[PDB]
Design a protein around this nucleic acid. Structure first.
Lengths: 139, 100, 144, 143, 189, 72, 81, 61, 67
RNA sequence: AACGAGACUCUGGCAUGCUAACUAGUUACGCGACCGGUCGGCGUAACUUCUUAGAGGGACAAGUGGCGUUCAGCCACCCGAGAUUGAGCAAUAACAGGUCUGUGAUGCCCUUAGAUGUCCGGGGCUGCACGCGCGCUACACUGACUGGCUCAGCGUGUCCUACGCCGGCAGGCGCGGGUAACCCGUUGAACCCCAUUCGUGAUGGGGAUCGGGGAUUGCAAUUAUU
């Protein structure tokens, strides 16, 4: 049937739902081609270009994205799709193609399956930010 | 008919003990309950200059208080409602009851 | 099969919907369009002489996307940055008279009906008119 | 990509010179009293294209520009758009221009110098007017 | 295969120096689609050497205070700078970039040794990693100085900087500053 | 010194545009501007009618940068 | 009639800091020497089962110049939660 | 001419502020000869240096 | 730097000299035998004792230790 | 042996394992709109992936390979969410360090009825030849202008405000919600991004300065409140 898997950059959280389909990839009910920042278009295209159009042929993935910024949200989609296809296999096909896809993805990029744990450090008094301090006056 | 019990405290240990006691008592009698739902914690922040005279190196105290909330829902008459609450009494816990 | 406005581009669709409204003549244009700015955080008047048609198209698209708005809610949409001299820049808002008389010169089209628990929404005919133009934009994309 | 036949490098509008290679929506802004929002609304009401260089204008077009410019009221220009709206001495809504704009500032200062207002004495002494902090800034001109 | 921006291949690029061959990451596992990976190469030592050289070029161009986070503008600057060189030279812009990196790095330098006052500098060697880093620095510095107040768009002054360096020409900021730098170090032999 | 650029085409500059430019391999508003000593707007406007006539091929188009080449 | 006040006894008086910081105040206010007033408080604190005690007295004890006398006994922690 | 030498081991850090590194380098041609050199920048074993003047041997900085 | 302290080293030495029979080479089992016996506060302090125990049991196979 | 260091508390990163949800949602199914698709259009049932917050786990230089008087430890690597996250607290002994202008903390000295108490009216604290420190805006094309498209988190609220009408706007009138995961608010933020115009120039960069109007807060805006 279906699986629901999330991807997560700084504060953005994309959730991809996959079921039996015919090759539809859509984020927010919108085509993957026209996600607003076209400069980072290939990051969204990396999983399907690496694996191939024939693996997303019996699967229908719909993504809902919320939080964070534009660049973080784009990075939260390429991870969500990759994780959801890995989760769709090893549950509906076998434990043999999940390994193949997981390897192919993780040699190219580890952030396609593992989330970056970095988050903003809190501001500290006595400076504009976490580390920067105010200019010190002598005489 | 619907009975909403709202619990609010600052000590989560005491508040959770009270909530567990209330839920267990309602299970003990023949009642149907809606489980404890936790509202987001309320964090109140006061930041103050440490010095009383504005002389030193401009250090600041960061003060804060935390308020914990729960909600429980029952379907029972008020006669049945007003036994378990009277059994369990704990300081710092603000129990409130609303009939629909 | 068919399309919606979500299946096509938006910067080209607004340019194409704004031309469908300009060729019917039912849209009623205020007397002050040649003089007024669109917000208080803008230094010049809009470059396009037909800004009212483009803004009407953009408001129609926003109403299609999210159902229900108002004059101030449709003024938050077209807000931006105001550069305050030697003081830091700040978020600023648009003009409510424009936000309200683009939302009124769309009831003369029978294309926007007042929302029940709020402001404005889209009519079935208004949904039709946007889908039938998304169709032409998609055809232009496919055949080229 | 155009090669107009008649094209003047420097034209004369309202006792001041204007570059013909400059663009019309910003060329007339050169003459005093006109900014970047009054110079555009005058051109819209005169129905003159803004894409042309100032040189690419016939005699009638330039003569019309001054006509709508100097009489904004007759061509449905709102009253809040001028540079002296409710005048002190006669109370008329008029747009003053290059030779008149500076002929109605000296009168404004002479009013407050003859009638010894505080701000007219500030303008007289050369100090500042809008209630500023003169302790630190403004040390140019002063020796 | 996986080619930069979808149209510039990598398998045809050859690194000349054996010295900088392992400090330039262009060919097999570094063949990416974009100079954008959200990498963490600045966590341990010598990790930056695994960063793709095109992405290394991209970062150093978002310099001076007004550009410190505008990476998407630099991705299109590099994208347009690669499609211009190929129109002039007709070669692979990746090969042109590699040849510029090789040419514009100093191979000998000078280090302060005398006590404060009179300058008694010596002559020392240069690490391959520092040579790559400083080639990138010089190439990016010459691109933005030549474009600061010109009609010439950037990504056209970067292309001209990269062309003149892959030829080892004296019409190049990086070559000019590399020659002046090894000149002084020879004087201090 | 000052950089005085022609705002409008005369005979010599127009002929040099029509003949010399279409073989540059690097038709570009920033290039044609220094070649013909004309303003960045006149060259920019003149490079679209060359495309309309079919004499040059468009390579790249964007806000910050537009890039043309020769025919064939 | 809503509010009612009740009075009760502290279980152990020697381990309450306030009851000892007020007991020592009524000995310095009644003519005891400071050195003997402070040892009489430390002794009662330790004999009641405390693990450690510290008593500090500050002010003009000798003339027009102030100074501090500190009396410690046992263990005393200073840092952490 | 230009020689190429391969770093075999890192000895220590020299310079007024520790900005240079002692290395012993082995030549590619006539590999039997190994000499002491000073470098500038991050160096690890296996790095190959390009020596322009290949006669000097290093000393403390 | 990752250097233990006299508290953890003393506690681990005592545990080893008192319960040699049950302790072994596995960390995750020594982590569970320490919680059963010694009254230790939180996991971070529990683990640093049960890690030095596992480290210090390997040395015993090499021969005796002076502690 | 003890204090200090460490430990400790709060916080960030992980759990498709547990306990839960109409003041959070998702999936499915109906009704509906439009051309199988889209719907933050409307209503039911599957539950907790997403949201919220409680419990318990989880990381210890633990495993491997080197170095180390083979100890204490250091370097690299695999696996792994993570192989140093950031703060709070903080010793003995001192300083003629700041605070009598925070206090019904306080000793002396001064004054106390044409007052050094207290209230009322109007001024000053900001004045300006000149020096000395924190800063905010810039010196532009890696830009400005004009349109279009598209994303947060921490907080406040019985002053925060949705909706409708007149206004270019600043701003005004009538009904509504919220003592709040219930309403502003699915917080449609700005840089970012996509098209246009400008074209190296004290220029459409940059905004100081100053003149006319208009509107708000207040008893009062004149030494311009905003």
């Amino acid at each position: 049937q279906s699986v629901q898997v999330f991807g997560r950059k700084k504060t953005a959280t994309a959730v991809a739902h996959c079921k039996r389909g015919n090759g539809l990839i859509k984020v927010n009910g919108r085509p993957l081609e026209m996600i607003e920042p076209r400069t980072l278009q290939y990051k969204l295209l990396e999983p399907v270009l690496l694996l191939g159009k024939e693996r997303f042929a019996g699967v229908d993935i719909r993504v809902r994205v919320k939080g964070g910024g534009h660049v973080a949200q784009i990075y939260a989609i390429r991870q969500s799709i990759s994780k959801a296809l890995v989760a769709y296999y090893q549950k509906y096909v076998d434990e043999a193609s999940k390994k193949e896809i997981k390897d192919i993805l993780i040699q190219y990029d580890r952030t396609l399956l593992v989330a970056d744990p970095r988050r903003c450090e809190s501001k500290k008094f006595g400076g504009p930010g976490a580390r920067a301090r105010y200019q010190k006056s002598y005489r | 008919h619907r009975i909403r019990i709202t619990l609010t405290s600052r000590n989560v240990k005491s508040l959770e003990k009270v909530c567990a006691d209330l839920i267990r008592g309602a299970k003990e009698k023949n009642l149907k309950v809606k489980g404890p739902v936790r509202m987001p914690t309320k964090t109140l922040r006061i930041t103050t200059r440490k010095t009383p005279c504005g002389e030193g190196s401009k250090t600041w105290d960061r003060f804060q208080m935390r308020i914990h909330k729960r909600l429980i829902d029952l379907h029972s008459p008020s006669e049945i409602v007003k036994q378990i609450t009277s059994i369990s009494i704990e300081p710092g816990v603000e129990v409130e009851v609303t009939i629909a | 099969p068919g399309v919606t406005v979500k299946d096509v581009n938006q910067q080209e669709f607004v340019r194409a919907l704004a031309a469908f409204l300009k060729k019917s003549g039912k849209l009623k244009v205020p007397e002050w369009v040649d003089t007024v700015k669109l917000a208080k955080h803008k230094e010049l008047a809009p470059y396009d002489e037909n800004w009212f048609y483009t803004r009407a198209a953009s408001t129609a698209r926003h109403l299609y996307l999210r159902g229900g708005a108002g004059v101030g809610s449709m003024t938050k949409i077209y807000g931006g940055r105001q550069r305050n001299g030697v003081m830091p820049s700040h978020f600023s808002r648009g003009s409510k008279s424009v936000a309200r008389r683009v939302l009124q010169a769309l009831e003369g089209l029978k294309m926007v009906e007042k929302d029940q628990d709020g402001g404005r929404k889209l009519t079935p005919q208004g949904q039709r008119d946007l889908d039938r133009i998304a169709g032409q934009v998609a055809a232009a994309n496919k055949k080229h | 990509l155009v090669i107009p036949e008649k094209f003047q490098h420097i034209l004369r509008v309202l006792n001041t010179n204007i570059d013909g290679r400059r663009k019309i929506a910003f060329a007339i802004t050169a003459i005093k009293g006109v900014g970047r929002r009054y110079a555009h609304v005058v051109l819209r009401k005169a129905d003159i294209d803004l894409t042309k260089r100032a040189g690419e204008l016939t005699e009638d077009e330039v003569e019309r520009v001054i006509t709508i410019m100097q009489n904004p009221r007759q061509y449905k220009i709102p009253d809040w758009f001028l540079n002296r709206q409710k005048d002190v001495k006669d109370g008329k809504y008029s747009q003053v221009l290059a030779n008149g704009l500076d002929n109605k500032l000296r009168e404004d200062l002479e009013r407050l110098k003859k009638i010894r207002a505080h701000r007219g004495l500030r303008h007289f002494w050369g100090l500042r007017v809008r209630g500023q902090h003169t302790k630190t800034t403004g040390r140019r001109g002063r020796t | 295969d996986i080619k930069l921006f979808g149209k510039w291949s990598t398998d045809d690029v050859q690194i000349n120096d054996i010295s900088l061959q392992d400090y330039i990451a262009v060919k097999e596992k570094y063949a990416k689609y974009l100079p954008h990976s959200a990498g963490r190469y600045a966590a341990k030592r010598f990790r930056k050497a695994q960063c793709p050289i095109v992405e290394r070029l991209t970062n150093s161009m978002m310099m001076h205070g007004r550009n410190n986070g505008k990476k998407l503008m630099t991705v299109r600057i590099v994208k347009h700078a690669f499609e211009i060189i190929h129109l002039l030279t007709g070669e692979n812009p990746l090969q042109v970039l590699v040849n510029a990196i090789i040419n514009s790095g100093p191979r000998e330098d000078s280090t302060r040794i005398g006590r404060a006052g009179t300058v008694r500098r010596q002559a020392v060697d240069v690490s391959p990693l520092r040579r790559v880093n400083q080639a990138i620095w010089l190439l990016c510095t010459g691109a933005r100085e030549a474009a600061f107040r010109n009609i010439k768009t950037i990504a056209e002054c970067l292309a001209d900087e990269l062309i003149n360096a892959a030829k080892g020409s004296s019409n190049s900021y990086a070559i000019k500053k590399k020659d002046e730098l090894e000149r002084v170090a020879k004087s201090n032999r | 010194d000052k950089l005085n650029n022609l705002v409008l085409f005369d005979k010599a500059t127009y002929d040099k545009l029509c003949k010399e430019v279409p073989n540059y391999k690097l038709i570009t508003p920033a290039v044609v501007s220094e070649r013909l000593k004309i303003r960045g707007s006149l060259a920019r406007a003149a490079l679209q009618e060359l495309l309309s006539k079919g004499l040059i091929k468009l390579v790249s188009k964007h806000r910050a940068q537009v890039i043309y080449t020769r025919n064939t | 009639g809503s509010v009612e006040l009740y009075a009760e006894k502290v279980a152990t008086r020697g381990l309450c800091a306030i009851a000892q910081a007020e007991s020592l105040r009524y000995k310095l206010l009644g003519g005891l020497a400071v050195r003997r007033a402070c040892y009489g408080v430390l002794r009662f604190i330790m004999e009641s089962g405390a693990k450690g005690c510290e008593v500090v007295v500050s002010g003009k004890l000798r003339g027009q110049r102030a100074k501090s006398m500190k009396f410690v006994d046992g263990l005393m922690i200073h840092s952490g939660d | 001419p230009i020689k190429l030498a391969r770093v075999t081991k890192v000895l220590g850090r020299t310079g007024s502020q520790g900005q240079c590194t002692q290395v012993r380098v082995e030549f590619m041609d006539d590999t039997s000869r190994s000499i002491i050199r000073n470098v500038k920048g991050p160096v690890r074993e296996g790095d190959v240096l390009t020596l322009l003047e290949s006669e000097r041997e290093a000393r403390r900085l | 730097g990752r250097v233990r302290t006299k508290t953890v080293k003393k506690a681990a030495r005592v545990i080893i000299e008192k319960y040699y029979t049950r302790l072994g080479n596995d960390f995750h089992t020594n982590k569970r035998v320490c919680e059963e016996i010694a009254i230790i506060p939180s996991k971070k302090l529990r683990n640093k004792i049960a890690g030095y125990v596992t480290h210090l049991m390997k040395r015993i196979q090499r021969g005796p230790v002076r502690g």
